[PDB]
Design a protein around this nucleic acid. Sequence first.
RNA 1: GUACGUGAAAUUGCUGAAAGGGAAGCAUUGGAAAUCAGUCUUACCUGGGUGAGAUCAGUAGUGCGAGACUAUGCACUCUGAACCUGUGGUAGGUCAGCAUCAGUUUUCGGGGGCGGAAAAAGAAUAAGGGAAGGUGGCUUUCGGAGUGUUUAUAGCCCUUGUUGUAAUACGUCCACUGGGGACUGAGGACUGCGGCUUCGUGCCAAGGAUGCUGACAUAAUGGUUUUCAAUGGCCCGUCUUGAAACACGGACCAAGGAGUCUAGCAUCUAUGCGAGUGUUUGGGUGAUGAAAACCCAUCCGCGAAAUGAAAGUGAAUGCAGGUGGGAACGCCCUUGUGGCGUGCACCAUCGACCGACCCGGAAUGGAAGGGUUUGAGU
RNA 2: UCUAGUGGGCCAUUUUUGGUAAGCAGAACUGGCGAUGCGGGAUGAACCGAACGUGAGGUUAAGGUGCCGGAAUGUACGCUCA
RNA 3: GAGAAGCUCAGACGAGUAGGCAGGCGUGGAGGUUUGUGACGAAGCCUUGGGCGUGAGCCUGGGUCGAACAGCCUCUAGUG
RNA 4: ACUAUGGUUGGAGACAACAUGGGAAUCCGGGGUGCUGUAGGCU
Lengths: 51, 200, 186
Amino acid sequence: AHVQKKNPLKNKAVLARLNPYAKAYKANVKLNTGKTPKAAGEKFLTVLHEN
Amino acid sequence: IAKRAESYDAEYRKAEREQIELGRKARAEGNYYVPDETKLVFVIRIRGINNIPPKARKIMQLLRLIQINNGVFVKFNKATKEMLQVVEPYVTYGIPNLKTVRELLYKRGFGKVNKQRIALSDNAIIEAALGKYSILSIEDLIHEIYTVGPNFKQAANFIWPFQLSSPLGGWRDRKFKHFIEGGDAGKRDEHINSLVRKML
Amino acid sequence: GIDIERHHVRKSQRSKPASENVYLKLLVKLYRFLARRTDSRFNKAILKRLFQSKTNRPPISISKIAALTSRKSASLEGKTTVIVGTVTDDERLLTVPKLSVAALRFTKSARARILKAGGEVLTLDQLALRAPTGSNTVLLRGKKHAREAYRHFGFGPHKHKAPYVRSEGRKFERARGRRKSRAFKV
RNA sequence: GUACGUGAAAUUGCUGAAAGGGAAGCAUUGGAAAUCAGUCUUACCUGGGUGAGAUCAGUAGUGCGAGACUAUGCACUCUGAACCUGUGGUAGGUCAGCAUCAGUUUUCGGGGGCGGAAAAAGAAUAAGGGAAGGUGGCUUUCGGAGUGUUUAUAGCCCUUGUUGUAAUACGUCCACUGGGGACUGAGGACUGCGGCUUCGUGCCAAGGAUGCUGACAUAAUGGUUUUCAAUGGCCCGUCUUGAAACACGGACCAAGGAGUCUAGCAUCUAUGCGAGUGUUUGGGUGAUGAAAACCCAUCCGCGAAAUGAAAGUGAAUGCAGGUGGGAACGCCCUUGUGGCGUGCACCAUCGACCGACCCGGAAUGGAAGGGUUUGAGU
RNA sequence: UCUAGUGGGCCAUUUUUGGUAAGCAGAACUGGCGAUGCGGGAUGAACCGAACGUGAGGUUAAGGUGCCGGAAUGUACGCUCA
RNA sequence: GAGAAGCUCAGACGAGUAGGCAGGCGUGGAGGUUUGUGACGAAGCCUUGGGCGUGAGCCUGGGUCGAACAGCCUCUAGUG
RNA sequence: ACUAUGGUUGGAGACAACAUGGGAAUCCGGGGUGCUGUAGGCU
């Protein structure tokens, strides 16, 4: 049993044998649908520049 | 197992988002938000087995950093911090991220079963070893290591020390001075992820 | 290079008897099977003691067996006594009780007295057949340090051990170094 | 062939091969030359042709059921048996090429999510502020040389409005996706974990390579020998902190050449017997033939009792004692690194008994009572 | 439990003592050579890296990339004529 | 079944003087065994041939040779 | 100040800087000039 070690990061069949959630895993979920404000702050900018 | 992995992934995203909004709120208000100090640290032994003082040799034996290019996961407390301070010239340690932990446990994940180094090719091996701690999958092991759960000691000890290869692209010009001085020794913070990336 | 200290590497236990007795090998083969195919520590103990040397298997006497199984708070009335070694006779016990003894070998006088008293003598294969897991069995051992060599082992200053003396009496290691009247006493 | 059984090495002559610019010898790799290995495709089996043959399945009689074998006969040839051919099939080394894979690895891309001053810039647009001049204008003088005011016919710098959730760069991530190169193919019916399924001993990149082709077969691949080229290689042994040493021994070869035997002792192991153990000092079968093997009695050696210089004395209060750990076993709790009961061995410890010593000690005796002690004892 | 060899040491970092000094003598800690091959310092017992079964592939340490010699007569800013 | 002194699966490791241990190679002689080899050629010796073993060593082809020699289990030593 | 650890750091050296850690003394100034247990006497 287990004569050879397969890399799950390269072998998708092993990546399915382990981690069954990998089938339903969803990446690159977009969440910038809003107005995208600019939370900079007057005090933060003055301190950031300063001298 | 799939439900647990989905919950863990949701927890990771929620924690990452929460830190982002807190930082944005601090920037907007002009105050300062200090985040939580790291509880998990990945340590890689960079020095060989030649010319090692007895105290540093004993500490590296207790940290299981026996061979060069070996990596371990350690919970970061006062006792561990002082041990790493003593062995600073011989190891480099930093804060691992989710990708580093999962890639390490996937490609180079080996478990200590019957005092033997067994590849983590099936979840059954992990259940047989850490079933009493509700660790039933490699994703459960990843979650336990990454979040430093109540069974971190058993999970980390079960994980055989990682036998990393020599980095692709090499080390810096001089390998045996501190990371602050321009070398590869001592604390490197998030740069351990890039070092593991080229060493994996 | 790997920095590993090698201290407990080679096990110091026998995996095979030093004796070339074919019948002893047959007994070892039987109890190798019993130890492997049963979850009883008695079979493992018997198999381990089958490998032991003569000095590690001291003889026991029927008086010692009778004394151990006739204790007030013992309840070892009819249980079988098992010893991996020789059972000797003790002539100081004029009357022999009824004993069920299993052993590697029996002295002729001891075996005759046991049979005359009404007991039974069994070999290890017979014991295995009757009690395959050692249930209701009193496992005994002889006194390991009852031999001569342990009177001298550990000899030294203020150790109170027996020296290696050519003869016994005065003029033989009973002088300076043994009494206060001659320099010092050990 | 008497310089005579066979006839090694050191050393030497001839012949043959090879190499050689102030050493040679060696190791790795390959080239050249010389030499060796394959009988591959044999063997079981079967397709096809003919010949011939005392002939096969199921049976019948000859140990009571089932089964096996031998023998006697039936069954008389679409079947079973011997026997010959085809350059009969699967043909079989060696070398390659290409695909689909698995493991390892190197290298070049493309797409997307998130983060920061939800980058900093910047472009086009509306309202501003400033001084260096582009000097537009003014001015020595028709050709310059300089002015002295804030956009004139140029243009810079600094603020806020939007378009705008701007892009780009960087960092991080994607169980997102494309190619190129190299090394490896270990295991050998099946079982396992997964995915797809028409739900089937179905299919798959899922517990380790298969498939399709071709060329050679006095070629190729390997093995050996010599030599060449590249790289590396100091003379062995010894004493020594340290030897290549300008430290010692060693010109070469053959043969010989150095931890043995005995009287003891100690540890360990094996064998036999076992509170016993040892027949060989000796005697007999014994003459035949008996340096052997076999048998036999009384002493004795060691052990079963120690202590003291000695005269002497001389080991159970108890289950041959108590305590702690403790193998094995038995009984329960429920899974425990669980409790209960005895408890082998061994260690540590508190005692008891024997001898010696120190006591009191109620002519000879030291019986009871003791002790901070002492013994290689029970 | 039994027994072998050893009972001449030496080097380097750091802390020192005696000495004018010494490749000198004597102490302490650690790592080494002795008994340690290998890559580097042109060479070297101790220095740097690294501790060794027989091989294939990949990547490194210390060290290097003009030729000998495998690897940029690479990139950016300066100094120097001996 | 796989010399149970056997079969099978898995993991880790591998410098070494003085020194210790174990398993093996080789030599002379002795007991047992091999319808053992041999004048149709034993032992020995030479070899610009072959094979096996990490190794001590072993087997074999060719030439010379002429009288004895070997495998296995034990015993033994003036054994490398 | 000093000091543990590190570099094929600088310097001829003495020494110094840097990196990961630990961390004084003294001076001066501010504050203060006894607390408490037991037993018993006190316009």
